[PDB]
């Protein structure tokens, strides 16, 4: 029955040892192997929804308050995060807040940076002020994309975004992606700086709240995306 026959393959560049991997996997390109068990295949159904999606960054794209104790607060007690826009601070050059910086923010971007490490994209930010309809006021928002150590009215230098409240909230200011290279590290390497600055007062009438405030929540998108995985982690959590 000898052809030949078959003779031969004998590459084998191997070492028939993964071969069957282990190793383990990367990057998939290894489908259901040494099949299988057996056999056919399933036929599921919704609902659910007709939501079969990759992405990922579609699940980012959701405005989420920054942590709890950011300032911190919530409770912690009150504030009642966002500090307080409350009369006394006037002097049109002041207010309070701060970044340092960063990317925690633990509204689930914690978990993203706790699995992937690299990315490119912006951190669209929202400030949302709550007060009744009577009183009104303006205030700005500084953000520097580098960034430095606090660092005063150069917040007048850099980016801006005026704020009127109002009917009705909330607000927005974006950032374009700013850095050298292309990817950035997702750990404690770098990001910018953020203040809110009272310029004119938030006034009050004799029947009024007299105290008005903020909440600030960021999200990443819609240009963004992540590159490569890593084990991290935060133990675990």
């Amino acid at each position: 029955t000898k052809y030949k026959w078959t003779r031969t393959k004998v590459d084998i560049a191997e070492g028939p040892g993964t071969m069957n991997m282990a190793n383990v996997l990367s990057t998939t390109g290894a489908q259901s192997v040494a099949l299988v068990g057996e056999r056919a295949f399933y036929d599921p159904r919704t609902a659910g929804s007709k939501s079969r999606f990759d992405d990922m960054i579609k699940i980012a794209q959701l405005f989420s308050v920054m942590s709890d104790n950011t300032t911190p607060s919530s409770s912690s007690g009150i504030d009642k995060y966002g500090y307080f826009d409350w009369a006394a601070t006037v002097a049109p050059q002041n207010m309070v807040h701060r970044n340092v910086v960063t990317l925690d923010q633990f509204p689930n971007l914690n978990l993203f940076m706790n699995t992937y490490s690299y990315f490119r994209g912006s951190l669209i930010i929202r400030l949302s002020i709550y007060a009744s309809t009577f009183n009104r006021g303006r205030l700005r928002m500084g953000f520097f994309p580098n960034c430095t150590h606090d660092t005063q009215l150069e917040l007048d230098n850099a980016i801006y975004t005026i704020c009127d409240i109002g009917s009705d909230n909330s607000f927005e200011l974006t950032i374009p992606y700013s850095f050298s290279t292309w990817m950035r590290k997702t750990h404690g390497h770098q990001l910018g700086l953020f203040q809110v600055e009272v310029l004119n007062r938030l006034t009050y009438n004799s029947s009024s709240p007299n105290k008005v405030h903020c909440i600030v929540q960021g999200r990443l998108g819609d240009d963004a995306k992540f590159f490569c995985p890593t084990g991290s982690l935060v133990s675990f959590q």
Binding site: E38, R39, A40, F41, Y42, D43
Partner: protein, 198 residues
């Protein structure tokens, strides 16, 4: 329209009528929806016997060699055994050998019939090296055709000779699966085997 035992016509059954009414469950409108991929054979024959497992058996005392020829009952079988009545098929054997660190070899084949002297290698051979995988398929033949008793059982024999010796113990494993069962099966499904009299 409500049937009548000891009446017509046959062993068939029916559509069992499209009652209730509806109503909305309630009696009918039962239409099959295949959930799986669909292999659907999970209800069908072939496939199931296609899987294997069975007897985990045949330990081995070293001294000496020879055989003993062992009678494969085919059942057993005894794990997936809940399934049967009938007679036949053309096997697929799986053999495994746990022994001396890559020292030794195992020769095996079958069978037929009653007895012999003899040189076994005539009726066949399948040199399986130490610590290797459990692989054969037999076809059939005399094997007097006529199918096979069905509860002999199971009409046969395996012949296992562990060649040389490495002075330590030795062990083997035998799994079975029978493929493309002609089976039919025939005269189903008499041997009700409702024993459960376990």
């Amino acid at each position: 329209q409500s049937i009548s035992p000891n009446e017509l016509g046959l062993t068939s059954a029916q559509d069992d009528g499209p009652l209730g009414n509806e109503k909305p469950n309630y009696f009918l409108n039962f239409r099959t929806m295949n959930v799986d991929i669909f292999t659907v054979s999970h209800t069908k024959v072939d496939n199931i016997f296609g899987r294997a497992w069975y007897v985990a058996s045949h330990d081995f005392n070293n001294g000496d060699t020879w055989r003993q020829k062992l009678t494969f009952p085919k059942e057993g079988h005894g794990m997936l055994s809940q399934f049967f009545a009938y007679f036949t098929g053309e096997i697929n054997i799986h053999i495994l050998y746990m022994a001396e660190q890559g020292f030794l070899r195992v020769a095996h084949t079958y069978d037929t019939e009653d007895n012999r002297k003899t040189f076994l290698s005539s009726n066949g051979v399948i040199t399986i090296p130490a610590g290797e995988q459990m692989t054969l398929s037999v076809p059939f033949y005399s094997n007097k055709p006529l199918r096979t008793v069905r509860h002999d059982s199971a009409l046969g024999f395996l012949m296992c000779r562990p060649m040389m010796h490495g002075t330590t113990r030795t062990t083997a494993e035998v799994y079975i699966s029978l493929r493309c069962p002609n089976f039919f099966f025939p005269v189903p499904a008499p041997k009700p085997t409702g024993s459960r009299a376990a």
